[PDB]
Design a binder for this molecule. Structure first.
Ligand SMILES: [Zn+2]
Lengths: 168, 140, 142, 183, 344, 47
RNA sequence: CCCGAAAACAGGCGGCCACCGAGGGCCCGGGAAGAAGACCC
RNA sequence: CUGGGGAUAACAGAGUCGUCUCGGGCGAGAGCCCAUAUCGACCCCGAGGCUUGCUACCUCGCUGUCGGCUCUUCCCAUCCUGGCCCUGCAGCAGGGGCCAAGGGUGGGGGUGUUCACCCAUUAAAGGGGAACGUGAGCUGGGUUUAGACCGUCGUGAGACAGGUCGGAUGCUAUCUACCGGAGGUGUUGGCCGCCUGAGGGGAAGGCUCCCCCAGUACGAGAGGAACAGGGAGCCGCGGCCUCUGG
RNA sequence: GUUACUCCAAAGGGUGUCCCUGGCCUUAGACAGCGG
């Protein structure tokens, strides 16, 4: 398939409505929560977008697999509540190539529209796996089209990344 | 000396003139099944644009057999040029020539296939290839 | 004629002053052309001047360019660069100048000016090279 | 900046005399003179009660590093006119024993790996080479000259074409002015 | 793409007629022995010898055929001394002294000669120059020389040349020159048999020639031979640059060029047209005379190989500037046969 | 044919696994590329 | 190694004339040079 | 056939780079074990415009031609030649990388072919750019103008981004450019001769084999090196006519 | 670098140098040496 520099920008209108789009495809990604889904952990390691993006589902799935494998091999299912927050709604289209006669693209895939400083994914963990959560952060960051940054969140809604990073 | 006991190659001082280019036919002077060969290559020769490889007395050529007993016909062989019609110079200044153009069929390492050569050969060839002068009666 | 000792002077600033004098109408003689200095890194400087020397017309080498290899001529050429060489005024100005390596007998024991706004104590960083060094690298007899 | 008046001080020993005139430092001891140019903008050198002082008036990190480099150099000059320096070298061979000779301003090594041609190594002015069995000693007053002579002798025996695990013949350094070499 | 090398060399360009028919010498060799560093003569002919090889290689010790060119060298007249000092860019002539008694025929070349100029004035000028040389102002001393082609009945107009002197000490050179001025020089007093020489002359003239001969370009296909372009080149170049390049081969002057040829061995110096073998004296002039030349009568050099120039032409000779390490020894080689048979 | 005198000066080097350059023994990143993967020079055959 | 005083600082040196005349060219017998010119005897 | 049109296609140029070619980041892992000697998934970031397409800014009587022959020059993104580094580098060799474009990179068979395939040699028989360099330089095999045959489609006249046979290649150089040859002026009087040598040009040289080192080091064997030192040739360059041939 | 625009290459890395911050150490700390 085509490079993501074509689809990372957010300047086109939203194109979501299934009852008017003909030939629209289904999602390749199907799982969005992982691990222990009730354990009431302490720390929330969340990724945020630096600027607005459109992320493809191919990338989303690559991230899913990579991160969950790291976390399962080095933490264990009974910990590490992993979640992907954003669903792919926008339909990507390509012009069936005649030339520019009758150019209006046929559907080829899906992406999720993310705005500036919008949470993409989260890993809830306990005190003694922060380093593995941050490894997941870095692995994910490396597979996105634009830049991102992570925060560490406590209960009560507070940002604690400074000091929690300092002590390690 | 590593292996001087029995050697195949020698050293001549003369360097005759390259007289026989690719495409030349040669009468075979030894007692192998071959009778006439044709030159398709000259061993150890690099040229330039549109120039053909050429050989003289004492040089090893690659040839194809054209006439001869059936086991040898259509085979690619190595041979040493042993007689030529074009004049060449000796150290004293005198020119020497022969009556025909003739070769003897050998192995890449230099060993003769055959037991006798019929007629006269050149001293230059007998000197560069030592095992031919033993199976040739007359040497000049 | 004003006589200027180039020992320890920054080449471009010297050349600017000299070009203005020649345009105003004065005769100038520069001595010790080999002892003027050029600031910066040796590799970049030498690469510039070698690239200058390997420039030629592809169809005929008798039509130039003819960038110099000697030190006096390097200095002369810099000054020429600072003048209106395409006009008669500039040509006459350029004829009013002479440059010399070392000090010839004819100028011995004489008054040597100095240009204050060119001087290397003015500098702070020690990365510098000499015009004679450049000439030697390019292959000039001095 | 780091500070305001970085000032380093070296105390002169028993019989040494330091002259400082014009970016050139000169040292006299029991044995031989020694000279060295040490210049950088803003760095000054002069003499005190007995001391050699290096001083700069509003330094940056790089300037600090340079001041302390200059100090190291002066101390080596002083220790060298006071005592001197000596390096040690060892010779090893599997096959083909090599003969090492001192003749003039060159060291000559022959039969290295079986080679008919001898290798040669320069000896810089003011350095003495002795050969005792399988061992070579290089002694003098100038640290840089001594080290350079030793490095010349060691590089005169260098192999690029074959595996150095199996082929180890050569001449190697084992001690630089006291501190031994260890892996 | 098929690759191949270009047609001819760019190192002898422009390929023009020589400035003069007397060749100049641009560089001189370093020779410790204080002597005059060359000589001049006239080409006479070719022949061959048979001799025992002395050069390194195989065939050392064997009898071999060797071709030979003969140069007739009558004695030169040393007529002047010239001094050189150091200029701003290079050497500059300081002063010349000429000798006072000159042959009549020298005016055919130097039309305006001094008139009174007695022996006494000559000695005074030499004293001036000696004092100048003793001061320390002088960087080089050279001799001024002229040929005498009236001793062989070739001409009356002489050739005038300037030669250099070997060694380092300017004072020693000047003493040599002061000895030699006003006297004849013979080639035996300068050259050693068995030496390697460089040879300098102007080549045979051929006039205007085309590029097949001048640069060795290919003759075109037989279709072009029938179309009128057989002995032409194909094209003068590409669309851009939109000009003909100087490197493209074209027609013009071929021959009459200045050339230097390295490392020719002097094999023998003769006397009055005769050469000495073990016992006997033999005339080298062949039966009937050298063609386009006659009879050698004065003094001659044998130089092995070939040299530039037509037969009756001025040749200059110097010692080798670019010789190899494996030299032949500086003695005459053992000669067994010299060809005296007719050459026509 | 072991010669530790020689090993101590033949095999006290580091190598970068990205660029291939040799680097001084007590280093943390590469002279040229800045990479952090530096391994000791193979003092015994591997494989 | 080849070209090279038109190198615009457009050079250095020895000698001749000049401040009728040094010197040059054509013409003549030629060729080792040569499309005309040029070169050489 | 006429009148017109770059308001509008084919082609060279110009733009762009989906596609293409060349790279990189992280690291799933493969490699007795060992992420990175070698190989590197999936995702993500780029360079070039020599591959094809997209567009329609320039040109409709500029030249419209492909391939081959001839001739010159440039780049490096290096096949050989010079020098180095790592190795799952014993030696002989291999694999992967760095500097380096001074020189070399050829001869043949079928086909109009470029390309690709094959043969024998070879140190190797690298590739690109210059209006897919080069028709006021040659050729004209190919490119379905006018004649003709086969197949297929079509009532038919006819057609075929199908095949096959045949089928016009003009030029007295105006200006500039280059190769060489001459005549003037200037250089502050004119003339003869000898020199200096600023500056420009050069590949004037490049490569292979053989002997010896040595059946040695290395190595279980089998195999099998190097420095120095001696000889010969091939390609390129410049000259000459004694010998040999025309 | 010496570019207002017409007409300027990133993901990812370097603490190379100049600066603002926050924790753990510091009358003996980070090594550097003699020893258990
Ligand atoms: Zn690296």
């Amino acid at each position: 398939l085509r490079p993501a520099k074509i689809d990372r920008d957010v300047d086109k209108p939203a194109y979501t409505r299934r009852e008017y789009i003909r030939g629209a495809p289904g999602p390749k990604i199907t799982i969005f929560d992982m691990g222990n889904l009730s354990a009431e952990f302490e720390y929330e390691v969340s990724l945020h977008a630096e600027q607005a993006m459109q992320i493809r589902q191919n990338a989303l799935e690559a991230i899913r697999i990579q991160v969950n494998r790291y976390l399962q091999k080095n933490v264990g299912r009974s910990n590490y509540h992993f979640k992907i927050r954003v669903y792919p709604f926008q339909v990507l289209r390509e012009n069936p190539m005649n030339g520019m006669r009758r150019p209006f693209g046929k559907p080829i895939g899906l992406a999720a529209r993310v705005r500036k400083d919008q949470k993409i994914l989260t890993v809830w963990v306990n005190g003694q796996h922060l380093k593995f959560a941050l490894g997941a952060m870095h692995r994910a960051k490396m597979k996105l089209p634009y830049s991102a940054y992570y925060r560490i969140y406590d209960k009560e809604g507070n940002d604690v990344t400074t000091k929690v990073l300092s002590t390690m | 000396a590593k292996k001087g006991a029995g050697a195949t190659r020698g050293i001549s001082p003369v360097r005759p003139t390259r007289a026989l280019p690719i495409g030349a036919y040669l009468k075979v002077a030894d007692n192998s099944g071959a009778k006439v060969i044709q030159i398709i290559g000259v061993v150890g020769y690099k040229g330039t644009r549109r120039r053909l490889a050429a050989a003289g007395v004492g040089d090893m050529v690659v040839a194809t057999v054209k006439k001869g007993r059936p086991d040898m016909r259509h085979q690619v062989v190595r041979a040493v040029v042993v007689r030529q019609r074009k004049e060449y110079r000796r150290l004293d200044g005198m020119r020497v020539k022969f009556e025909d153009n003739a070769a003897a069929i050998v192995t890449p390492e230099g060993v003769p296939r055959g037991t006798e050569i019929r007629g006269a050969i050149a001293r230059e060839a007998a000197e560069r290839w030592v095992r031919l002068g033993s199976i040739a009666s007359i040497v000049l | 004629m004003r006589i200027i000792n180039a020992e320890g002077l920054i080449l471009g600033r010297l050349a600017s002053k000299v070009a203005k004098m020649l345009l105003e109408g004065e005769e100038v003689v520069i001595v010790n052309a080999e002892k003027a200095i050029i600031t910066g890194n040796r590799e970049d400087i030498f690469a510039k001047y070698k690239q200058r020397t390997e420039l030629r017309t592809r169809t005929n080498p008798r039509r130039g360019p003819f960038y110099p290899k000697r030190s006096d001529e390097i200095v002369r050429r810099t000054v020429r660069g600072m003048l209106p060489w395409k006009t008669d005024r500039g040509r006459k100005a350029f004829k009013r100048l002479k440059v010399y390596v070392g000090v010839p007998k004819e100028f011995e024991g004489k008054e040597f000016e100095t240009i204050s706004e060119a001087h290397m104590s003015r500098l702070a960083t020690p990365k510098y090279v000499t015009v004679g060094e450049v000439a030697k690298f390019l292959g000039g007899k001095f | 900046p780091v500070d305001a008046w970085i000032r380093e001080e070296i105390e002169i020993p028993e019989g040494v005399e330091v002259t400082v005139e014009g970016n050139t430092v000169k040292v006299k001891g029991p044995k031989g003179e020694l000279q060295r140019e040490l210049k950088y903008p803003g760095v000054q050198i002069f003499t005190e009660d007995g001391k050699v002082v290096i001083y700069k008036e509003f330094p940056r990190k790089k300037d600090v590093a340079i001041v302390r480099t200059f100090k190291a150099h002066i101390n080596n000059m002083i220790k060298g006119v006071t005592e001197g320096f000596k390096y040690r070298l060892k010779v090893v061979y599997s096959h083909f024993p090599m003969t090492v000779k001192v003749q003039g301003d060159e060291v000559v090594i022959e039969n290295f790996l079986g080679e008919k041609n001898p290798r040669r190594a320069k000896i810089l002015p003011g350095v003495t080479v002795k050969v005792k069995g399988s061992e070579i000693e290089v002694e003098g007053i100038d640290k840089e000259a001594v080290g350079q002579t030793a490095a010349n002798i060691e590089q005169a025996t260098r192999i690029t074409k074959w595996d150095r695990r199996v082929f180890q013949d050569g001449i190697y350094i084992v001690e630089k002015a006291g501190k031994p070499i260890k892996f | 793409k098929i690759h191949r090398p270009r047609r001819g060399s760019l190192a002898y360009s422009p390929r023009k007629r020589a400035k003069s028919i007397v060749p100049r010498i641009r560089s001189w060799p370093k020779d410790s022995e204080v002597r005059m560093l060359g000589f001049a003569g006239y080409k006479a002919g070719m022949t061959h010898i048979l001799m025992i090889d002395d050069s390194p290689g195989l065939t050392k010790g064997k009898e071999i055929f060797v071709p030979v060119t003969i140069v007739e060298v009558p004695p030169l007249f040393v007529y002047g001394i010239r001094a050189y000092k150091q200029g701003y860019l290079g050497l500059e002539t300081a002063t010349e002294v000429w000798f006072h008694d000159l042959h009549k025929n020298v005016a055919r070349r130097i039309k305006t000669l001094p008139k009174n100029y007695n022996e006494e004035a000559f000695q005074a000028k030499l004293g001036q120059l000696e004092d100048l040389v003793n001061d320390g102002e002088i960087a080089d001393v050279r001799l001024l020389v002229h040929t005498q082609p009236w001793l062989i009945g070739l001409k009356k107009k002489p050739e005038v040349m300037e030669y250099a002197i070997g060694g380092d000490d300017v004072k020693a050179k000047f003493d040599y020159a002061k000895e030699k001025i006003g006297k004849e020089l013979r080639a035996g007093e300068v050259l050693h048999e068995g030496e390697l020489l460089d040879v300098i002359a102007v080549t045979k003239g051929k006039g205007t020639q085309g590029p097949v001969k001048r640069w060795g370009v290919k003759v075109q296909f037989h279709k072009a031979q029938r179309a009128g372009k057989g002995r032409h080149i194909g094209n003068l170049g590409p669309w851009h640059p939109a000009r003909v390049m100087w490197t493209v081969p074209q027609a013009g002057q071929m021959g009459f060029h200045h050339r230097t040829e390295f490392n020719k061995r002097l094999i023998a110096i003769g006397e009055n047209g005769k050469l000495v073998l073990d016992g006997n004296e033999i005339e080298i002039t062949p039966k009937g005379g050298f063609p386009h030349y006659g009879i050698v009568r004065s003094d001659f050099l044998m130089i092995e190989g070939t040299i530039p120039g037509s037969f009756k032409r001025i040749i200059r000779v110097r010692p080798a500037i670019r010789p190899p390490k494996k030299k032949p020894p500086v003695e005459r080689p053992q000669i067994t046969y010299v060809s005296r048979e007719s050459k026509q | 044919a072991r010669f530790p005198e020689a090993e101590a000066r033949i095999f006290r080097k580091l190598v970068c696994m990205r660029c291939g350059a040799t680097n001084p023994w007590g280093a943390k990143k590469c002279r040229k590329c800045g990479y952090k993967g530096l391994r000791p020079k193979a003092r015994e055959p591997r494989g």
